[PDB]
């Protein structure tokens, strides 16, 4: 996702990625009070990137989500440590190839 740069671009420190297993639409940030303890969101602290000069400095912060169920929709969004937050995107993990549903059906 886009790199964030405040007015004085100096000392950029942190991103925060949120993801939960979601059905359709009905997902919000301020959902079922994360408060202190039992949480409603799976959270990742993402270290600020390294710029690497001025011409082509988009060394786009990212993250590899592992430990996800297959054929599952995930509500996901990023936030900049207390600037900008991304919108809630739903991402569905991969499921079976049609070919591979067939096999398992067609061969005991």
């Amino acid at each position: 996702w886009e790199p964030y740069w405040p007015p004085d671009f100096r000392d950029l420190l942190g991103f925060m990625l949120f993801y939960k297993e979601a059905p359709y639409q009905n997902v919000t940030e301020f959902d079922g009070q994360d408060a202190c303890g039992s949480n409603s969101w799976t959270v990742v602290d993402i270290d600020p990137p390294l710029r690497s000069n001025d011409p082509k400095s988009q060394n786009h912060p990212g993250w590899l989500m592992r430990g996800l169920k297959p054929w599952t929709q995930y509500a996901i969004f990023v936030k900049t440590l207390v600037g900008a937050k991304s919108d809630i995107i739903y991402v569905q993990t991969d499921a079976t190839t049609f070919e591979d549903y067939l096999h398992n059906v067609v061969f005991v």
Epitope: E2, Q58, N59, H60, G62, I89, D94
Partner: antibody
């Protein structure tokens, strides 16, 4: 950041050819290498990808048995082998690091 | 597979003209579209990510926009180096797919 590809690649039909893509200027292991085919006078087709960290791949069904994707983290170089080449004529193959930066292209010509 | 329909496949224009190319998505792709530029030497370069975000170094005469299922690339004032090939690409869903391309040619 540079994806520096191989070829000219002249190959006989029924053979196999391995095209490389040496990466530099960034941490190889952190990104995906995607491969794309371009049949001249035409568009771009997505072949599939590799994650150099895990060695995990995903292919386009069209290219499943044809292309085989490989990475050598010791040299930070990625490969693509094409198999059983026949009347493909010529095509230019590109690797790209998650689309922002692409390699220059490698022409594979099949001739006897 | 999401089909990306690119129009026009070819376009004649002159220096200093404003031109737009379009990609229509067969399914909703949200904001997940790239615009790619290919030089006569074959070099591919990304100009726009996430429908409207310009990559570092890309001249400001390049812009991306969306209206319904139409994603457009606009060159506000053509330069001689812009008369090359352009391709859209969707990354919203598992089979990544490309538009058929637009060749931009000089009017005579």
């Amino acid at each position: 950041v540079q994806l520096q590809q191989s070829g000219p690649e002249l190959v006989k039909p029924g053979a196999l050819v391995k095209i490389s893509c040496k990466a530099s200027g960034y941490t190889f292991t952190n990104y995906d290498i995607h491969w794309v085919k371009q049949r001249p006078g035409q568009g771009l087709e997505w072949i599939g990808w590799i994650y150099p960290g895990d060695g995990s791949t995903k292919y386009n069904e069209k290219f499943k048995g044809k292309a085989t994707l490989t990475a050598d983290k010791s040299s930070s170089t990625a490969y693509m082998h094409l198999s059983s080449l026949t009347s493909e004529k010529s095509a230019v193959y590109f690797c790209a690091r998650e689309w922002a930066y692409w390699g220059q292209g490698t022409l594979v010509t099949v001739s006897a | 597979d999401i089909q990306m329909t690119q129009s026009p496949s070819s376009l004649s224009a002159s220096l200093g003209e404003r031109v737009s190319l379009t990609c229509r998505a067969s399914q909703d792709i949200g904001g997940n579209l790239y615009w790619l530029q290919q030089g006569p030497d074959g070099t591919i370069k990304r100009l726009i990510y996430a429908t409207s975000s310009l990559d570092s170094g890309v001249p400001k005469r390049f812009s991306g926009s969306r209206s319904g299922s139409d994603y457009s690339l606009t060159i506000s004032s053509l330069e001689s180096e812009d008369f090359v090939d352009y391709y859209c690409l969707q990354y919203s869903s598992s089979p990544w797919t490309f538009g058929g391309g637009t060749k931009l040619e000089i009017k005579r």
